[PDB]
Coordinates of all heavy atoms in Angstrom, one line a residue:
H91 N 13.3 4.4 1.7 CA 13.0 3.9 3.1 C 13.2 2.3 3.1 O 13.0 1.7 2.1 CB 11.5 4.2 3.4 CG 11.1 5.6 3.3 ND1 10.4 6.2 2.3 CD2 11.4 6.7 4.2 CE1 10.2 7.4 2.5 NE2 10.9 7.8 3.6
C92 N 13.4 1.8 4.3 CA 13.4 0.4 4.6 C 12.3 0.2 5.6 O 12.3 0.7 6.7 CB 14.7 -0.2 5.1 SG 14.6 -1.9 5.4
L93 N 11.3 -0.6 5.2 CA 10.2 -1.1 6.1 C 10.7 -2.4 6.7 O 10.7 -3.4 6.0 CB 8.9 -1.3 5.3 CG 7.7 -1.7 6.2 CD1 7.3 -0.6 7.2 CD2 6.5 -2.2 5.4
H94 N 11.2 -2.4 8.0 CA 11.6 -3.5 8.7 C 10.3 -4.3 9.2 O 9.6 -3.7 10.1 CB 12.5 -3.1 9.8 CG 13.8 -2.6 9.4 ND1 14.9 -3.3 9.1 CD2 14.1 -1.2 9.1 CE1 15.9 -2.5 8.7 NE2 15.4 -1.2 8.7
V95 N 10.0 -5.4 8.8 CA 8.8 -6.2 9.1 C 9.2 -7.5 9.8 O 10.1 -8.2 9.2 CB 7.9 -6.4 7.9 CG1 6.7 -7.2 8.3 CG2 7.5 -5.2 7.2
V96 N 8.6 -7.8 10.9 CA 8.9 -9.0 11.6 C 7.8 -10.0 11.4 O 6.8 -10.0 11.9 CB 9.1 -8.7 13.2 CG1 9.5 -10.0 13.9 CG2 10.1 -7.6 13.4
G97 N 8.2 -11.0 10.5 CA 7.3 -12.2 10.4 C 7.7 -13.1 11.5 O 8.8 -13.1 12.0
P98 N 6.8 -14.1 11.8 CA 7.1 -15.1 12.8 C 8.2 -16.0 12.3 O 8.3 -16.3 11.1 CB 5.8 -15.9 12.9 CG 5.1 -15.7 11.6 CD 5.4 -14.2 11.2
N99 N 9.1 -16.3 13.3 CA 10.2 -17.3 13.0 C 9.8 -18.6 13.5 O 9.8 -18.8 14.8 CB 11.5 -16.7 13.6 CG 12.7 -17.6 13.2 OD1 12.7 -18.7 13.0 ND2 13.9 -16.9 13.1
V100 N 9.5 -19.5 12.6 CA 9.0 -20.9 13.1 C 10.1 -21.5 13.9 O 9.8 -22.3 14.8 CB 8.6 -21.7 11.8 CG1 8.2 -23.1 12.2 CG2 7.4 -21.0 11.1
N101 N 11.3 -21.3 13.6 CA 12.5 -21.9 14.4 C 12.6 -21.3 15.8 O 13.5 -21.7 16.5 CB 13.8 -21.8 13.6 CG 13.6 -22.4 12.2 OD1 13.0 -23.4 12.0 ND2 14.2 -21.7 11.2
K102 N 11.6 -20.4 16.1 CA 11.5 -19.9 17.5 C 10.1 -20.3 18.1 O 9.8 -19.8 19.2 CB 11.7 -18.3 17.5 CG 13.0 -17.8 17.0 CD 13.1 -16.3 17.2 CE 14.4 -15.8 16.6 NZ 14.4 -14.3 16.7
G103 N 9.3 -20.9 17.4 CA 7.9 -21.4 17.9 C 6.9 -20.2 17.8 O 5.9 -20.4 18.5
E104 N 7.0 -19.3 16.9 CA 6.1 -18.2 16.9 C 4.9 -18.5 16.0 O 5.0 -19.2 15.0 CB 6.9 -16.9 16.4 CG 7.9 -16.4 17.5 CD 8.9 -15.4 17.0 OE1 9.0 -15.1 15.8 OE2 9.6 -14.8 17.9
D105 N 3.8 -18.0 16.4 CA 2.5 -18.3 15.8 C 2.5 -17.9 14.3 O 2.6 -16.7 14.0 CB 1.4 -17.6 16.6 CG 0.0 -17.9 16.0 OD1 -0.2 -18.8 15.2 OD2 -0.9 -17.1 16.3
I106 N 2.2 -18.8 13.4 CA 2.2 -18.6 12.0 C 1.1 -17.7 11.7 O 1.1 -17.0 10.7 CB 2.2 -19.9 11.2 CG1 2.5 -19.6 9.8 CG2 0.8 -20.6 11.3 CD1 3.9 -19.1 9.5
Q107 N 0.0 -17.7 12.5 CA -1.1 -16.7 12.2 C -0.6 -15.3 12.3 O -1.3 -14.4 11.6 CB -2.2 -16.9 13.3 CG -2.8 -18.3 13.3 CD -3.6 -18.6 12.0 OE1 -3.4 -19.7 11.4 NE2 -4.3 -17.7 11.5
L108 N 0.5 -15.0 12.9 CA 1.0 -13.6 12.9 C 1.6 -13.2 11.5 O 1.8 -12.0 11.3 CB 2.1 -13.5 14.0 CG 1.5 -13.5 15.4 CD1 2.7 -13.6 16.4 CD2 0.7 -12.3 15.6
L109 N 1.7 -14.1 10.6 CA 2.2 -13.8 9.2 C 1.2 -12.8 8.6 O 1.6 -11.9 7.9 CB 2.4 -15.0 8.4 CG 3.0 -14.9 7.0 CD1 4.3 -14.2 7.1 CD2 3.2 -16.2 6.4
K110 N -0.1 -13.0 8.8 CA -1.0 -12.1 8.1 C -0.9 -10.7 8.7 O -0.8 -9.7 8.0 CB -2.5 -12.6 8.3 CG -3.5 -11.7 7.5 CD -4.9 -12.3 7.6 CE -5.9 -11.5 6.7 NZ -5.6 -11.7 5.2
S111 N -0.7 -10.6 10.1 CA -0.4 -9.3 10.7 C 0.8 -8.6 10.1 O 0.8 -7.4 9.8 CB -0.3 -9.5 12.2 OG -1.5 -10.0 12.7
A112 N 1.8 -9.4 9.9 CA 3.1 -8.9 9.3 C 2.8 -8.3 7.9 O 3.3 -7.2 7.6 CB 4.2 -10.0 9.3
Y113 N 2.2 -9.0 7.1 CA 1.9 -8.5 5.7 C 1.0 -7.3 5.7 O 1.1 -6.5 4.8 CB 1.3 -9.6 4.9 CG 2.3 -10.5 4.1 CD1 2.4 -11.9 4.4 CD2 3.2 -10.0 3.2 CE1 3.3 -12.7 3.8 CE2 4.1 -10.8 2.6 CZ 4.2 -12.1 2.9 OH 5.1 -12.9 2.2
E114 N 0.1 -7.2 6.8 CA -0.7 -6.0 6.8 C 0.1 -4.7 6.8 O -0.4 -3.6 6.4 CB -1.7 -6.1 8.0 CG -2.8 -7.0 7.8 CD -3.7 -7.3 9.0 OE1 -3.3 -7.1 10.1 OE2 -4.8 -7.9 8.8
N115 N 1.3 -4.7 7.3 CA 2.1 -3.5 7.3 C 2.4 -3.0 6.0 O 2.6 -1.8 5.8 CB 3.5 -3.8 8.0 CG 3.3 -4.1 9.5 OD1 3.1 -3.2 10.3 ND2 3.5 -5.4 9.8
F116 N 2.4 -3.9 5.0 CA 2.6 -3.5 3.5 C 1.6 -2.5 3.0 O 1.9 -1.7 2.2 CB 2.7 -4.7 2.6 CG 3.9 -5.6 2.7 CD1 4.7 -5.8 3.8 CD2 4.2 -6.4 1.5 CE1 5.7 -6.7 3.8 CE2 5.3 -7.3 1.6 CZ 6.0 -7.5 2.7
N117 N 0.4 -2.6 3.6 CA -0.7 -1.8 3.1 C -0.6 -0.3 3.4 O -1.4 0.5 2.9 CB -2.1 -2.4 3.6 CG -2.4 -3.7 3.0 OD1 -2.2 -3.9 1.8 ND2 -2.9 -4.7 3.8
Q118 N 0.3 0.0 4.3 CA 0.7 1.4 4.6 C 1.5 2.1 3.5 O 1.8 3.3 3.7 CB 1.3 1.6 6.0 CG 0.3 1.1 7.0 CD -0.9 1.8 7.2 OE1 -0.9 3.1 7.1 NE2 -2.1 1.2 7.3
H119 N 1.9 1.3 2.4 CA 2.8 1.9 1.4 C 2.3 1.5 0.0 O 1.9 0.3 -0.2 CB 4.2 1.2 1.6 CG 4.7 1.5 3.0 ND1 5.4 2.7 3.2 CD2 4.6 0.9 4.2 CE1 5.7 2.7 4.5 NE2 5.2 1.7 5.1
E120 N 2.2 2.4 -0.9 CA 1.5 2.3 -2.2 C 2.3 1.2 -3.0 O 1.6 0.5 -3.8 CB 1.4 3.6 -2.9 CG 0.3 4.5 -2.3 CD 0.0 5.7 -3.2 OE1 0.6 5.7 -4.3 OE2 -0.8 6.5 -2.9
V121 N 3.6 1.2 -2.9 CA 4.4 0.3 -3.8 C 5.6 -0.1 -2.9 O 6.2 0.7 -2.3 CB 4.9 1.0 -5.1 CG1 5.7 0.0 -5.9 CG2 3.7 1.6 -5.9
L122 N 5.9 -1.4 -2.9 CA 7.0 -1.9 -2.2 C 7.8 -3.1 -3.0 O 7.2 -3.8 -3.7 CB 6.7 -2.7 -0.9 CG 5.5 -2.0 -0.1 CD1 4.2 -2.4 -0.5 CD2 5.7 -2.5 1.4
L123 N 9.1 -3.1 -2.8 CA 9.9 -4.3 -3.1 C 10.2 -5.1 -1.9 O 10.6 -4.6 -0.9 CB 11.3 -3.8 -3.7 CG 12.3 -4.9 -3.8 CD1 11.9 -6.0 -4.9 CD2 13.6 -4.3 -4.3
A124 N 9.9 -6.4 -2.0 CA 9.8 -7.2 -0.7 C 10.3 -8.6 -1.0 O 10.1 -9.2 -2.0 CB 8.4 -7.2 -0.1
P125 N 10.7 -9.3 0.1 CA 10.8 -10.7 0.1 C 9.5 -11.4 0.7 O 8.7 -10.7 1.2 CB 11.9 -10.9 1.2 CG 11.6 -10.0 2.2 CD 11.0 -8.7 1.4
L126 N 9.4 -12.7 0.5 CA 8.4 -13.5 1.2 C 8.6 -13.6 2.7 O 9.7 -14.2 3.1 CB 8.2 -14.9 0.5 CG 7.6 -15.0 -0.8 CD1 7.8 -16.3 -1.5 CD2 6.1 -14.6 -0.7
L127 N 7.7 -13.0 3.4 CA 7.9 -13.0 4.9 C 7.9 -14.4 5.5 O 7.1 -15.2 5.0 CB 6.8 -12.1 5.5 CG 6.7 -10.7 5.1 CD1 5.5 -10.1 5.9 CD2 8.0 -10.0 5.5
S128 N 8.8 -14.5 6.4 CA 9.0 -15.8 7.2 C 9.6 -16.9 6.3 O 9.7 -18.0 6.8 CB 7.7 -16.2 8.0 OG 7.3 -15.2 8.9
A129 N 10.0 -16.7 5.1 CA 10.7 -17.6 4.2 C 12.1 -17.7 4.6 O 12.6 -17.1 5.5 CB 10.5 -17.3 2.7
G130 N 12.8 -18.6 3.9 CA 14.2 -18.7 4.2 C 14.5 -19.2 5.6 O 13.8 -20.1 6.1
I131 N 15.5 -18.5 6.3 CA 15.8 -18.9 7.7 C 14.8 -18.7 8.7 O 14.9 -19.2 9.9 CB 17.2 -18.3 8.1 CG1 17.1 -16.8 8.4 CG2 18.2 -18.7 7.0 CD1 18.4 -16.2 8.8
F132 N 13.6 -18.1 8.4 CA 12.5 -17.9 9.4 C 11.6 -19.2 9.3 O 10.7 -19.3 10.2 CB 11.7 -16.7 9.0 CG 12.3 -15.4 9.6 CD1 13.5 -14.9 9.1 CD2 11.6 -14.7 10.5 CE1 14.0 -13.7 9.6 CE2 12.1 -13.5 11.0 CZ 13.3 -13.0 10.6
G133 N 11.9 -20.2 8.4 CA 11.3 -21.5 8.6 C 9.9 -21.7 8.1 O 9.5 -22.9 8.2

């Protein structure tokens, strides 16, 4: 499976507080391989 997770994109002005909500999605899966949310081009 791919879990598509939307972290806030700082280069769009989106609230960084939403990063915690984004990571909460990971708790629905016992084990995951992941990147750091909102890193890279998300700013």
Side-chain angles (χ1 to χ4, degrees):
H91 304 104
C92 178
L93 181 68
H94 295 272
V95 179
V96 184
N99 190 324
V100 174
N101 308 317
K102 301 181 180 180
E104 293 167 350
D105 175 20
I106 194 64
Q107 299 296 137
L108 290 170
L109 187 55
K110 188 174 184 73
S111 300
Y113 273 117
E114 286 171 342
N115 294 284
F116 289 24
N117 288 322
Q118 300 295 317
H119 303 277
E120 286 190 1
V121 181
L122 318 83
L123 168 62
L126 284 167
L127 296 182
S128 300
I131 70 177
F132 280 65

